[PDB]
Structures are given as structure tokens and as C-alpha cells.
Ligand binder design. Structure first.
Ligand SMILES: [Mg+2]
Ligand SMILES: [Mg+2]
Ligand SMILES: [Mg+2]
Ligand SMILES: [Mg+2]
Ligand SMILES: [Mg+2]
Lengths: 495, 490
């Protein structure tokens, strides 16, 4: 995958023998932003929420640093409860930096559409109708492309469509940007895509946006690949699959006689604490190598039994995401949150009141400072098998190593898992983005059932270790690639 | 829903104040078949699973009784078990009543496509290309319509498309047909649909087909409604939801200290036995009214807590079936049974090796002849909530009372659940046809989790009973409608 930039310097990286191009970020590049943003007088940031404030504040600061006259203007829907917050952050009608969504879109040369997936599905025609011909629509996630594709539609021919997709939560996008004013390499990495380029400006505008957000590295992808990776990934190891496997394991361990609190520690605590830390620092091989000789056998039993069951569900989920089925189901699900067709409304409920999450509350409330939990070898084998199976599905489905590793390993162990170690998995299932929450609710049960029906049955039958799986794990090229990619991480902790 | 038949008389049924037309059959109507089948010289029966053998022999017998010269010809791949069986039943190349699939299609005025969902999805272009213009394609289930719609396609404009959908298993369609030669009104009821009628013959042909199958009554539906009811229904109460709720309840009861065998009895045995039998004989109200005063309170706690959670998943599933999402996922899943794209093969696995199914094997190995099991009021409340929630989704989504009742209540307690009581739920899931098996695996976990995460949490809160839900249940017009429909059973 190549791209052509007139403004920035393309650097090469090699992962498992596969070369990719990246664009290194840094404040020393800010003087290039006026050139990157030629033809741009106003950037309209549409929506507040999580990414809106972070991106608007970062862009504002970067453009000021660059001595650019470009105006960053927040556009909000009439029902928004975020006007006062926007004004408190210096985005105001008086200064020309806050307005109604439609007015704001109309005046913008680059429209950053940062409203919810559901709001995008409901509003795209009107958004398109308000945009200047030859202007640029920027997305920070590819949901809308997937939605249009599912309906046999595409974007209008008269606008460019680009994406800059940060590998971190909004608050971290802002936090690390401010830190980056002092610490070289502090910022949240992003990937970028150019879906349509109507006038030749799109690539430099995308890279300019990423650099101005403070991305220490910007990786190259396509909008189709980004949405498939993201929507599948959250149903996989990022959220859905981790919830499902921990329910399955907690049930198993307690069935075997383990005390509930210990069962929680050996499942949830271990995955989101010590296992995540170990993978973040030295990778998956170190998880196995850190075990006792006894523990290695247990790890291998779990991995050998769990790899294919996890792959079965991941493979199914990926194809449903790619085919249109899953995005269509998400769009319809959102519509069922309200009364229609004479039927009741069904907003999402909470998970946090079942057996293991009640136990988790107790565990965390008595948990010592900086406790990372026990490393249970069986739990480790299942979790690592899940990670390796997701990597393999994405590999065979044509994704780049940087995207596989950045979104399915690094962002998991460095961004999401630490968040989940602090608040519990239930918190995330109850409080994440709607599309991710729906995904977790739909697919967590699939992982629980397949582990329980197949993986655990294999272990309980005393099945022989599948040495093909184990040797493949130990020799997999991804481990070296993870080491290389892990060096491109931000220079401060991201969550 | 009206239809216009020149050959058969229709009569009305009134269900919850909604009138529908039905067509009463009987062997006494067989002299009407020649006119019903005007323009038909050969009926080609394509395929030989569970339905082919029954439909071929029933049509052959009915046409013989009618003194008709219409030829019933089986289209099958020479060199197979099915081919052997057809020859043993008297369909032969020598007599021109057995031949190659494509030659049979090409020579048929009515083509009955009885091959699997997967086979229809893989072969429809070739079937269509071999059909005579103005001939008639008959389906016994609407999967192929759902498949075509998912791809934004429809049938060719030069053929009629009809469906006749028996409410029973293939063996019963034949066995009861044979019984019906001696015992009046023995046979399996059907629904019919006319999706396309290119020359005005489609309705009489559909009804002739249904009557000639020995259907004591034929109900009216649409092909789209039939495939939605079927594909959603198997993910719901017919299979997937029963598996899910029983996993959830077994887990709950054992957590509460109930011994495992009793937990199995109070969930699976009760549902497929005494609860099913009670509903079959006297309906859902009788289930509630049979309970002790204490049991009634437990039923109501369970119903109040479970109705909406069940509805939530049923509503989701229904919309995925109707939108194209689910049928596409089924087609894709089939292709993952084999290696492709450098990825492994993933054939369907079994459910029967987990905790509750091992317990069930042990319980069943000792269960006496005709034990219907205990009627646990909490289980009854959950199961009845699920049934009422499915009824409500179907009703709001536009289905007729007869289709709701025949397919989601009657066929379930009278055909499917007795089969599951005999063979076990795990057996039914693990050996079911592919679309239903995939459905069960995908959706059972959803019902398990929604009950566990929501319904049971509500109960454990000591949430006050939702009196409107309970009142709505007791007064629901579906109960009277079931009584009326139940009387049209074979
Ligand atoms: Mg492209
Ligand atoms: Mg993402
Ligand atoms: Mg997402
Ligand atoms: Mg059916
Ligand atoms: Mg079916």
C-alpha cells in the first residue's frame, strides 16, 4: 500500500519481511501544516462527545503553533447538551468558533464528522447536501463507509473522503498531545486512509490532520480495512471475546471448586493486569516463558484446545462484518432503542449484576495498590490462543501487520485492558460506544459457548497436545513484528 | 389475505376476530385434481430427503385415485442411496418416472424443488435455465426467496412460483397420508403461497398440490412470511430459544443448590413433556391455572421478569432474518465448513458434551416409558413468557394468527417437542438440518445471556410484579384463537 505526499517525508518499516510506509510526526513538522492544508480556511468539527473536544483542541493548538489563519469551528446539533462545555473551552459564537451543525458544515472546507455511528447513519444525506462541492469529509472511523456499502451506495462523487483513526481514547488524544509539548514522541498514533480524492489535495490534508492531532506515527490503511478491523476487533479480543472467555473460565474454575474471588483474580484480574503488562513489555512468548515447567504444560493444554474454537467464532464474525450483515444488524438495533411498529423500546441493559461481576466489585474494593493479579497458566493459554487466532484471521483476510498489531495487540493491552483493570470489564460493556456495546453483547455469548462446548471438552477428554499449533505459536513471525511495532509506540503510557 | 381459486371451495376461520380463508381437503376431493392441474402433464419432484419420498408417493397415489394420466417423475443423481430408494418405491427409468435432475426439470410443467437450502442457493440459476417458460416452480419452504432477496434478486419473470408447506415431518406426511386412506381426516395440514402467477393457473395448482398431499386443511400465507416465520421461529421457541432458556435455568437452579438431575428434570423434561402436553391439550392458561397458589406467584415472577428480555432477542432475530443479514450469514457459514483462503475447516460441532447434557444422558437412560416430568412453576413462567413474546413479535410484524399458532405453538408442542422429549434436546440440535442448526448455535447463547443478565437479576431484586404484563397474558386474545385453531388439527 503506497501513497503520494508532496509535503511530508515517507519512512519505511519492515514487519515479518513486509514493508510498509509511515509518516513520523512531531512538533517540528507544524510549519508544514499551512502547505498540507492548502485550500482550507475553515475546519468544521461536527460533534462533541469523546473525540470532538480532543481533536478540536489539538488542531486549534497546532494551527496556532503553525501561525495558520485556519479557523477550527465546532458544529453541534440543536439538541446538544454540550454548548456550554464547548464555550468553556473557548469555542464560541462570538469568536466564530462554535455554531449549529448545518451552518458549520456549510462554511467548512474540511468537515470532521465525529458524531455517533447511529447519528451518521441517520444524517449522512443531509451532511452531504450541506457540503461545499470539492470539499473534504474526514472520518475517524469507517462505519459510514460500511453502512453505505451494505446498502449498495457510496459517497457523493463531488467530495474527497479521508480518515484519520487515533489508536487511543479521546481523553488520551488530548492528554498526550499536551505532554508532547514537553516530551518528544508523546501523542496517540493514528492510521490514515484516502477513500476518494477529487482534486489531488486529499492525502496531504489527511496527513496534515494526523500530524496536527499530535500522532507520533501515522500508519497507512484503507477505509474498508479500518472499519472491518475495528468492528470485528471489538467483537473479538478487544471486548466481546474477553468477556465471553472470562465468563466461561470463571464458571469452569468455580465448578472445579475454586473460591469465587480467586476465580475472578485468576481470570479477569490476570488477563487485564499481569498478562497484559507482560505482553505490552515483552510480547506473548514471554507470557509462556515466565511460567513454571508445570505451568507451561497447562498453558499448552489450554492453547491447543482453545485456538480453533476461538478462530471458528472470529472467522464467522469477520465475514459477517465484511459482508454487510453485521453493520446492518447494528443499524437496525439502534432503531429498536425506540418504539416503532407498535412494539416497545429496547435500550441496552447492564451486565454488571450477574454472579462474577458482583464478585469483581468485592475483589477490586479490597485490592492492594498496583496489584496486577496472578498469572494463571490455563487462563494465559486461552487468552494467548484467542490473540493468535485473531491475528491469523486478520492475516488471511489481507490486513497489514501494522494494523493487525496496532489495533489487535497494542491498543488492547495498552489502552483498553488497563482501563478494564481499573473499572472491570462490566464497566466497559456497559459504557463503551454503542456499536462496540452491541457487538460485545452479541458475540461474548458465542465465545463462552464455544469454549465451554469444545475447548473445555477437549481438555476434559485428556486430548493430546496439538504440536502443530504449539510449534506454530512459538515460531510465528508476528512475535518479531510485535517487537518492531512496539518500538513505534508513544513515549509515555497511553492508558 | 384473499385468494381466487376456480376449483376448490374455501371456508372461513375466525381467530381473535380476524377472519382467514382455509381450504378443506380430503380424498373425496380427488376428482377435482384434473381441473386443478389443467396444463400439467408431468410433475417433476426434484430431490429425495425427508419430503421427496412422501410428496412423490402421495401425489402418485392421489393422481391414481383421480384417474389422472399426469406423470410424477423423480429427478435425482443416478448412483446414490436416494436413487436406490426411489427405484425401490417403484419410480424407475424404465417407466419414465425416475431420471436425471436437469432432464426432469426440462420436461416438467410443475417443478417441486425439494433439495436442501444450500443446494437451492447453489443451483437456482441452472434450475431456472432448464425450466419451460410459463411452467411453475413449487417450493416447500421459502429459503430461496430469502436468499434471492438478500442479494437484491427475485425469481425469473417467466415462471410462476408457489409454495406448499406441510406442518410436519416428511415421514408423518407419508404415514398419515397412508393412514388417511382408512381414517378420515388423518394427514398433515399445510400452508400455501402464490409468489408469482404468470398465467392465472398458479392458485389452483398450489391448492391441487396441497390437497393431493392429503392436507386435511390448507392455510393461506405469503412466501416471505413463511420463510421469516420458519427461519426466525427455529432461532426462537422451536429450537434455539428452548436450548438457551434451559441452559440458563439449569445454571440458576444448580447455583441455588438444586441437585443436577432434578434441575435437568425441572427444565428440559418439564418443557418438552408435561408443559408441552398441557399447552397442546388445553393451552397456556391451563399451565398457569394448574399451578398451586404458591406456584402461581412463582410463575408470575418468572413471566414478569422474562417477557421483555425474551422479546428483545426475538425482535432482534426477526429483523436480522427479514433484512437479509441472517440468510447471508447462513450461506457464508456453509462455505467455512471447508478449507478456503488458507484458513482451516470448521464443520459444525456438538452441544451434548457440556455439564447439563451429560446429566441429561444419565437422566434419560433411566426415565420410564411416558414420564412427562415435573411442572416447575418458575420454568413454566419463563417458557410461557417466551412463547407469548414470540407471538407478540410475529403479530406486530404482520403474520396471521393461523401462521403464528400453527407454526409457533402447535407444530412446536405437537411435532417438535415430542420428538425432543423422545430423543433429547442435544440430539435435536446436533442432528438438525443445517440452517436450523446454525440458527440454534448462534441464538441459544443470546437467550441464555439475556435471561441470566436481565430477567434473573430482576427476580433477584425482588422487583414488584409488572401487573400489566400478567393481566395482558391472562386476557390475551391468542388463547381463544389457539382453541379454535387447535380444533383444525389432524
Ligand atoms: Mg479505495
Ligand atoms: Mg479502532
Ligand atoms: Mg469501534
Ligand atoms: Mg416451518
Ligand atoms: Mg427451518
Amino acid at each position: 500500500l503506497d501513497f503520494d505526499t508532496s509535503v511530508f517525508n515517507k519512512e519505511k518499516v519492515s514487519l515479518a519481511g513486509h514493508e510498509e510506509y509511515i509518516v513520523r510526526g512531531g512538533r517540528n513538522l507544524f510549519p508544514l501544516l499551512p502547505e498540507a492544508f492548502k485550500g482550507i480556511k475553515q475546519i468544521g468539527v461536527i460533534g462533541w462527545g469523546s473525540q470532538g473536544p480532543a481533536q478540536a483542541q489539538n488542531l486549534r493548538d497546532s494551527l496556532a503553533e503553525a501561525k495558520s489563519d485556519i479557523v477550527v469551528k465546532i458544529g453541534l446539533r440543536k439538541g446538544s447538551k454540550s454548548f456550554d462545555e464547548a464555550r468553556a473551552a473557548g469555542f464560541t459564537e462570538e469568536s466564530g468558533t462554535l455554531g449549529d451543525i448545518w451552518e458549520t458544515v456549510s462554511g467548512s472546507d474540511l468537515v470532521l464528522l465525529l458524531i455517533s455511528d447511529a447519528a451518521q447513519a441517520d444524517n449522512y444525506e443531509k451532511i452531504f447536501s450541506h457540503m461545499k462541492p470539492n470539499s473534504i469529509l474526514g472520518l475517524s472511523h469507517g462505519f459510514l463507509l460500511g453502512h453505505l456499502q451494505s446498502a449498495g451506495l457510496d459517497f457523493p462523487k463531488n467530495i474527497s473522503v479521508i480518515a484519520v483513526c487515533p489508536k487511543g481514547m479521546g481523553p488520551s488524544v488530548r492528554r498526550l498531545y499536551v505532554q508532547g509539548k514537553e516530551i518528544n514522541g508523546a501523542g496517540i498514533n493514528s492510521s490514515f486512509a484516502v477513500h476518494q480524492d477529487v482534486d489531488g489535495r486529499a492525502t496531504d490534508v489527511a496527513l496534515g490532520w494526523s500530524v496536527a492531532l499530535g500522532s507520533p506515527f501515522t500508519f497507512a490503511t484503507t477505509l474498508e480495512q479500518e472499519y472491518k478491523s475495528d468492528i470485528f476487533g471489538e467483537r473479538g479480543i478487544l471486548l466481546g471475546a474477553v468477556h465471553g472467555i472470562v465468563e466461561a473460565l470463571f464458571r469452569r474454575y468455580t465448578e472445579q471448586g475454586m473460591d469465587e474471588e480467586m476465580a475472578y483474580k485468576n481470570t479477569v484480574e490476570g488477563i487485564t493486569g499481569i498478562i497484559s503488562k507482560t505482553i505490552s513489555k515483552k510480547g506473548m512468548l514471554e507470557v509462556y516463558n515466565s511460567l513454571t515447567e508445570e505451568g507451561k504444560k497447562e498453558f499448552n493444554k489450554a492453547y491447543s484446545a482453545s485456538f480453533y474454537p476461538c478462530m471458528d467464532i472470529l472467522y464467522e464474525c469477520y465475514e459477517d462484518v465484511a459482508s454487510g450483515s453485521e453493520i446492518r444488524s447494528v443499524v437496525l438495533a439502534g432503531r429498536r432503542f425506540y418504539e416503532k411498529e407498535g412494539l416497545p423500546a429496547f435500550p441496552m441493559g447492564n451486565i454488571d449484576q450477574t454472579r462474577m461481576w458482583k464478585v469483581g466489585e468485592k475483589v477490586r474494593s479490597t485490592r492492594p495498590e498496583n496489584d496486577l493479579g496472578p498469572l494463571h497458566p490455563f487462563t494465559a493459554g486461552v487468552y494467548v490462543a484467542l490473540m493468535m487466532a485473531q491475528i491469523e484471521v486478520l492475516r488471511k483476510k489481507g490486513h497489514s501487520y501494522s494494523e493487525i498489531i496496532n489495533e489487535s495487540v497494542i491498543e488492547s493491552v495498552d489502552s483498553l485492558n488497563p482501563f478494564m483493570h481499573a473499572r472491570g470489564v462490566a464497566f466497559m460493556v456497559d459504557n463503551c460506544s454503542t456499536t462496540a456495546r452491541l457487538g460485545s453483547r452479541k458475540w461474548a455469548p458465542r465465545f463462552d459457548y464455544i469454549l465451554t462446548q469444545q475447548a473445555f471438552v477437549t481438555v476434559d477428554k485428556d486430548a493430546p497436545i496439538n504440536q502443530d499449533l504449539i510449534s506454530n505459536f512459538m515460531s510465528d513471525p508476528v512475535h518479531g513484528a510485535i517487537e518492531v511495532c512496539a518500538e513505534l509506540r508513544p513515549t509515555v503510557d497511553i492508558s
